Design a binder for this molecule. Sequence first.
Ligand SMILES: Nc1ncnc2c1ncn2[C@@H]1O[C@H](COP(=O)(O)OP(=O)(O)OP(=O)(O)O)[C@@H](O)[C@H]1O
Ligand SMILES: Nc1ncnc2c1ncn2[C@@H]1O[C@H](COP(=O)(O)OP(=O)(O)OP(=O)(O)O)[C@@H](O)[C@H]1O
Ligand SMILES: Nc1ncnc2c1ncn2[C@@H]1O[C@H](COP(=O)(O)OP(=O)(O)OP(=O)(O)O)[C@@H](O)[C@H]1O
Ligand SMILES: Nc1ncnc2c1ncn2[C@@H]1O[C@H](COP(=O)(O)OP(=O)(O)OP(=O)(O)O)[C@@H](O)[C@H]1O
Ligand SMILES: Nc1ncnc2c1ncn2[C@@H]1O[C@H](COP(=O)(O)OP(=O)(O)OP(=O)(O)O)[C@@H](O)[C@H]1O
Ligand SMILES: [Mg+2]
Ligand SMILES: [Mg+2]
Ligand SMILES: [Mg+2]
Ligand SMILES: [Mg+2]
Ligand SMILES: [Mg+2]
Lengths: 305, 305, 308, 310, 312, 311, 14
Amino acid sequence: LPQNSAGDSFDASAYDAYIVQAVRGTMENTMSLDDIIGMHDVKQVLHEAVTLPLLVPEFFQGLRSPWKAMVLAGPPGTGKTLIARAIASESSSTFFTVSSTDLSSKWRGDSEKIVRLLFELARFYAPSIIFIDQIDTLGGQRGNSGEHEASRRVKSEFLVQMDGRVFVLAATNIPWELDEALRRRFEKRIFIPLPDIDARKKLIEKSMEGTPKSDEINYDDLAARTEGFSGADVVSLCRTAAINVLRRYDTKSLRGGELTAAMESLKAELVRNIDFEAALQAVSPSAGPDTMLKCKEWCDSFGAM
Amino acid sequence: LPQNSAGDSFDASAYDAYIVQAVRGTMENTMSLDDIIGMHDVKQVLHEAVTLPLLVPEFFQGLRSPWKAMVLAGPPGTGKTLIARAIASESSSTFFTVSSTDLSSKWRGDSEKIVRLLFELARFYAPSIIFIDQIDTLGGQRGNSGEHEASRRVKSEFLVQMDRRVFVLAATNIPWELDEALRRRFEKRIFIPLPDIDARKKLIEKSMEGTPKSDEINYDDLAARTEGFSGADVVSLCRTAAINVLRRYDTKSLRGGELTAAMESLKAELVRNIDFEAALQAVSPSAGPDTMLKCKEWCDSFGAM
Amino acid sequence: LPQNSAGDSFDASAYDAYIVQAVRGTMENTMSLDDIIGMHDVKQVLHEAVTLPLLVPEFFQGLRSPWKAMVLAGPPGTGKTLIARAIASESSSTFFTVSSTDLSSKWRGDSEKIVRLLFELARFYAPSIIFIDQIDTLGGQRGNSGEHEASRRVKSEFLVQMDGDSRRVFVLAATNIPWELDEALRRRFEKRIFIPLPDIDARKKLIEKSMEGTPKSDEINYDDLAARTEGFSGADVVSLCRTAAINVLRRYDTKSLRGGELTAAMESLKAELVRNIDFEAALQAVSPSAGPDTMLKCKEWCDSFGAM
Amino acid sequence: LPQNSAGDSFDASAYDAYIVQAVRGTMNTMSLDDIIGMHDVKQVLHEAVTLPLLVPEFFQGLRSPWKAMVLAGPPGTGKTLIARAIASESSSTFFTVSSTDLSSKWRGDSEKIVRLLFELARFYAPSIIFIDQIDTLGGQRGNSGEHEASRRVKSEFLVQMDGNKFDSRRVFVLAATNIPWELDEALRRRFEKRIFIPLPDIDARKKLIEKSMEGTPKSDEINYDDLAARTEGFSGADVVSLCRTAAINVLRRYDTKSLRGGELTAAMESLKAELVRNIDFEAALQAVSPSAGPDTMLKCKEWCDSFGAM
Amino acid sequence: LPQNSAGDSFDASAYDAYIVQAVRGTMNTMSLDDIIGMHDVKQVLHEAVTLPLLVPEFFQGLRSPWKAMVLAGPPGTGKTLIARAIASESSSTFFTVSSTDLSSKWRGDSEKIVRLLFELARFYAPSIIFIDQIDTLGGQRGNSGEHEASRRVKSEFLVQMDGSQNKFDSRRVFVLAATNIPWELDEALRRRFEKRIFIPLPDIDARKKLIEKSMEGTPKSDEINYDDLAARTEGFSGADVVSLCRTAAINVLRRYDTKSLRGGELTAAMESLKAELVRNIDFEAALQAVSPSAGPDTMLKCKEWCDSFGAM
Amino acid sequence: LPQNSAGDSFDASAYDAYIVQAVRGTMNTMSLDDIIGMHDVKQVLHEAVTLPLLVPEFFQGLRSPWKAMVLAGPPGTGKTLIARAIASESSSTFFTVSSTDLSSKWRGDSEKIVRLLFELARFYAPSIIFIDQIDTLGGQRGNSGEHEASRRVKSEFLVQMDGQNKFDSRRVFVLAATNIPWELDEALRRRFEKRIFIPLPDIDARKKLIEKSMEGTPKSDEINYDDLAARTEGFSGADVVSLCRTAAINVLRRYDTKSLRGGELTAAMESLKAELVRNIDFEAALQAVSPSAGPDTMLKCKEWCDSFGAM
Amino acid sequence: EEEEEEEEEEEEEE
Ligand SMILES: Nc1ncnc2c1ncn2[C@@H]1O[C@H](COP(=O)(O)OP(=O)(O)OP(=O)(O)O)[C@@H](O)[C@H]1O
Ligand SMILES: Nc1ncnc2c1ncn2[C@@H]1O[C@H](COP(=O)(O)OP(=O)(O)OP(=O)(O)O)[C@@H](O)[C@H]1O
Ligand SMILES: Nc1ncnc2c1ncn2[C@@H]1O[C@H](COP(=O)(O)OP(=O)(O)OP(=O)(O)O)[C@@H](O)[C@H]1O
Ligand SMILES: Nc1ncnc2c1ncn2[C@@H]1O[C@H](COP(=O)(O)OP(=O)(O)OP(=O)(O)O)[C@@H](O)[C@H]1O
Ligand SMILES: Nc1ncnc2c1ncn2[C@@H]1O[C@H](COP(=O)(O)OP(=O)(O)OP(=O)(O)O)[C@@H](O)[C@H]1O
Ligand SMILES: [Mg+2]
Ligand SMILES: [Mg+2]
Ligand SMILES: [Mg+2]
Ligand SMILES: [Mg+2]
Ligand SMILES: [Mg+2]
């Protein structure tokens, strides 16, 4: 592990030589800063919790409490991960990452020291930010009967090391499998809904950039004829139209002879409206809506959303 | 672990001795993709996802980036583990064959490490294809009733890692038991139908190319008499016809004396029309089309062709 | 682990020391195929799937490649383990036998590695024969309710290993509840046959083949005993023969003679014939385990889905 | 684990600790003439246990000894008595197994305990296994709400109970039940003798009363023919309970509810030598009724007369 | 688990911790003269519990002490109070077992709990087991729609209740059970219960003695005719008469004005209310304001069952 | 499970972690005299849970306080409001059980909920358990289609409700509420001493409900309460309040306010709040919300409560 | 230095 800002050095000789090597492998991009096309409240909370206490540091202090957590829940198609990657590539904080794999070890006594070394590294390096992805697999119910004894010490060291600079963040897909004591430390549990008719039109106008498109397509009809689509299925639709541009010609029967001329003629052509019709004719939504309503019920019951 | 192009080597010294042995044990008999009868859209998606970025790597740059997943779902016997072998045959990419017995991991915290090393090694050899066979196992619902604490970690590692190119196939007999997020990451869900009245004539006239047929040229009649045969049963019909050519000459009594030329007299005998009646009156299809109708209903309500 | 033919050696290192012990525990000329009466179709399929690729191996190539599976089905007393012991005794193949009890362990990921090691050893040794008895368990459709998780991966390993080198295996099975099989597993079983109760003539040959050797009277009418059963299960005929052979001990009252002169009374009884009274008083005592609804369900299933 | 005859030693290396203990945990001097009636079961146990030790040259080929027996009938008739009688009369090893030595919360123990039980019963001696209440343990296989870990036990019994020409060590499997029509259609073929035991007639209850009353001083007023002709529909246990209610009634004739401590030990000294007259039986015949009306007896009589091999 | 007499100990090594805790969780100042009526139940308890403790040499052979009883009657009479009385006036350890002790999530736990219960009841003392509400625990064995665990609990009771083939080293166990539905038992478990007896609704003299017993300590007048209160409750159960006495004893509170007096003049008037006795008009109002839990068809069915298949 | 008085804490180490959460998920805007009429329920509630709080020494011996009550009768009469009022008026812990909480997947994981519920109710302060809709939980035991998963919760209620009887730790008062009481048990009915019938049509008390509900500040000449209370045949205690809501929402809709905007948008909603209610929108509320009560339930309930009812 | 394995249970339901 390297040094930090302001000239210090870490002494991790107490732990073994592979715990450092297994927690170091989680700590130069142009990721979408403004190109998340919903969730103004999440951008408000993140901009008031990471940037404004780090530009003017006396704006949020003490009785004006800065935040420390967020548990994003919702359907499996919306953009939870993109906001974490955007705040990773945007600010000047050492963005960590935690999976369900980096906290498992074959030996005994090595499944709890990793979390302690992780939080010590986060409170040593910088005003960091941790993104524990898929936290519903990490922390389940504590005192169950069909639970091995290896997870209770992990959640105990997690809750004992939670008190800590460090701004933790996590995103789930099943929020009701979280522990009853775990939700107390999560100061905000925000619901992330599927986009409405107003957001899909901006999604199509952003996802169809750089591609030559005919001036006959009507984005209101495309925004209104997709009742039920998640965030990702619209981008899949915009992919399927530009691939139908390729499959309209005959490129499977011919091969080898002067195909780069035909490929250049394919690169010359542009997207009509019938390609959007053929793309919307053969693309179905990802999942029928029950989990969206169940997570809305959970955030209405226990969440602050 | 062998090397790759430009002579580099993987630094897999942070893994155990049997994990790397398993991932190397799961890693070119020439078939042809035109030796499979039917499934034009499957060959089209496989063409656009595997063969065309090799020829012209500049057309697939932005929105026209190639596909990253596929699922073949349908009845048993329709040709799902044959296209995987064909595309393993006629390609220069590095194949893989993952299953459910390859992720046993009697210890704790090893199955997710094998999955991580599998994807980290498939992203090393730069053109790669991963073929997860029968993803019904290890692909169930994340919040099911009877589940362990390791199957959920395996499913979460699949969800994390599927977000230098790879391409992941799958095969299922019961697609409705798949997840929601894991169903979302598969960008192409394709139904495989039973062969119609035209494909069965082509299939018997392709399968019978070596043994001499003489007068049973009523292939339209022979494809109109089989009503609901499931593709992999009409091959058994032709095989039963050849063994019925054997069975008419009683060879149970001839013991030792000239058993080389008497079977050479069964090597010059032709498959007459008498054999296909006695092969049609002794072979029945293995199923009723309840799972076929339910697979068609699920692929019409959720399939992104 | 022994060394196979041509002096080769198996490198079993990644498997633990008890999986190999279990598969080694799964691994004559006592019987012969002429002892079993009836069952012409099963004898024909065994003859052109085990015996004939040993004499003329330059003929079974291409479309005429030999069979790779079979499953018998029928009433529960008609003989489908005896055919497995007969083909174990009249062949030169390393005969395996696998029940549903040596595929079980309480550790995660040991039930699906025994099957992989089983198929790898069956490929490695010889033109082997695998015989899985009572396959109605480790069957059952995968979309069932109340199915444990490891019993899904056992069926998945069975489904992957059973299709695909000139190394021959022949998976053979037997069951009484064939309609409770998996959907994608009764496709891999290339020959699903039915074996009925014995007809009016096979029971006379079974009576003769059981009662040969034992000294009997010359007035036993075999036709009356053949036509008087009328629904016997095939094993109940042998049980009828045993009852009619022990009735000649139950006729002389040997319940009070003990120690003195009893040991000569058994020597006096050892040379006594089996007369007609023994068969009458044995026919008044033995009844079959009837209820032919099982036979009718097996007949309807093997006539709507059976590939003889 | 102990040794056996000829000084061998078992080697249980592939099994854990709590399995061999659960099979070890299932491993006075009454005679077989204390059972009234049941000539068929006495004859079958005779020519299946007693005679293969005295003359072993007779039971060789077609006259091979039996391997199983199911007793089926109404409740309270003498199923679990003939098993302990043949246990205490013979010399062989006796396993009294029941449906609670075959269950554990782990997966893969309940079908290994059966294999270890049969391996020990074949290793030790010409032993005898007594599976009590098999209606709980083996039902029909293709059933409605059958758990997955019961198919393996039923198939384990079904595979182990029939399996070469060498190594002919003997194992006899005795079993009893009182709802026999729920047995599996493949498990009734294994039990190759399915005898039925009835309720006692008018000539067996006289002998049962005369056998049960020996040991207590009684008078010569009682007529056993009237007591045998009035107790109609009684089973064995209810006749023994009537013969016990008589003696407790001759306790009840001397009122001891008022006494407390003072000369109470010397109160029964005048009562411990009292006889049992006809008033005790004439009160106990209206004190005690049978336990159940006849429907299970008629159903078992209609079952064992069509599927029974005696 | 604590030790017993003669300083021995129990080796509970082959069971888990929660089974031992679930059995250990089920382990004064009354008398047998507090039970009005029930002569034959007291007779069987006398000649099966407290007589072998004093003179054990007499009960041998054909006079072996009983090890079973089931009290089946209508749901008003005294069937739990007699069990608590024979638990209080004894010197044997008591085990109360309901139907929700013998239940667990896993497979093969209820049979081990029943086995541990009977082994501790044989090990500790000449003990006694009271299985309350036997009809939810031992039902029928061949009915349609039962799980595969209740049948194993029934087979465990059927195997464990008889036994002890070794005629030497005999320790005593006595099983007692209470039932409202006695036609809902398996026949092989009904046979194992010797002395199945009926408990009836109280007669005139029993109700007179119960009103005379329950009205001690509370000050009453000298003009209450107990014969009218005996003859007017024709059909009352044994538990409704104490309810009648309680309503007649709080009717002296409902007679005065505490609902109108709110806060003030309430606790200062409760100090002199404790001396006001209970006259006839309070019993008349309580008899008009209390009706029995009637429907004697279930009493008729239970009496016909105990007259056809009963043993006293 | 936070704490109770005197700083003690519960030891629920013998149970699971979802059972205690499903029990903890069980734990008001009226006074005690807000519920008008039916003073017998007030009498039992006064001499059962109110008066033993001030004087703990009078209620001992034969005069022990009550421990059960049943509120049977027609639907929509004020049972839940009485339960909430006696909850909030005293300082008692208040549980609430329905049929949708005593059901889970695992066998035998339902009867632990009732035992933990009663152990918590005894462990905390003198508390009140409000078992609502007991016609679903406790029916008859010896039924025809009786399942084997509710007999054990019936038997657990029977065992737990009556259980060693003197020197009481703390009182616990269980309520009940049903629309059909003839489909009850015989050993569960007996534990419910002081069974009480409550009637729906109280015509002169419906006038008091009108005077406490019809709080319309305009229309000082629309006092026709005599005919509005004499036309209350079959009107339950909730349909009167629904009729007042219909009249008070139809006083602003009997005047045409559809598409009145553009000019003076703020005046169209301010000149409407003082509109006087008449009998024409009251006729719409009269013939719109008809009473949905028939005499097949009330007469059968009066035939049941007269025979086995201990007021 | 100890290791840890994974067992399998078997639960039932109605
Ligand atoms: N507001 C948005 N702006 C831009 N793209 C979006 C938006 N919402 C969804 N997407 C698209 O949805 C896809 C998935 O989103 P992301 O990468 O955040 O993973 P995710 O869906 O949050 O993961 P999970 O399945 O765990 O929810 C991306 O390819 C992205 O293009
Ligand atoms: N459309 C087809 N074209 C050519 N051959 C076919 C076709 N369908 C089936 N077959 C033949 O049938 C056999 C079985 O095919 P395959 O192995 O693909 O079955 P599958 O459906 O993948 O099996 P599973 O049901 O386990 O998924 C193959 O060997 C193949 O030769
Ligand atoms: N065709 C036959 N010829 C000779 N003997 C036979 C025949 N069929 C059955 N038997 C008798 O059947 C007995 C063996 O039982 P069998 O072979 O029927 O096992 P099975 O009942 O098929 O196995 P399962 O119980 O799994 O069905 C032997 O004793 C043998 O005498
Ligand atoms: N034939 C008999 N001779 C002597 N005593 C008998 C006979 N039959 C029954 N008994 C007596 O009946 C009593 C109960 O016998 P046993 O325990 O065998 O009944 P059971 O058949 O086991 O009951 P179940 O099998 O229904 O549980 C015994 O004490 C025994 O003395
Ligand atoms: N006697 C009464 N005094 C005051 N308000 C009453 C009276 N009767 C009914 N109400 C009113 O009726 C409304 C409905 O009462 P409640 O919410 O108790 O219905 P409910 O009786 O619980 O319905 P159900 O019987 O179907 O469970 C309450 O808002 C209450 O104000
Ligand atoms: Mg994500
Ligand atoms: Mg396949
Ligand atoms: Mg067999
Ligand atoms: Mg018995
Ligand atoms: Mg009671």
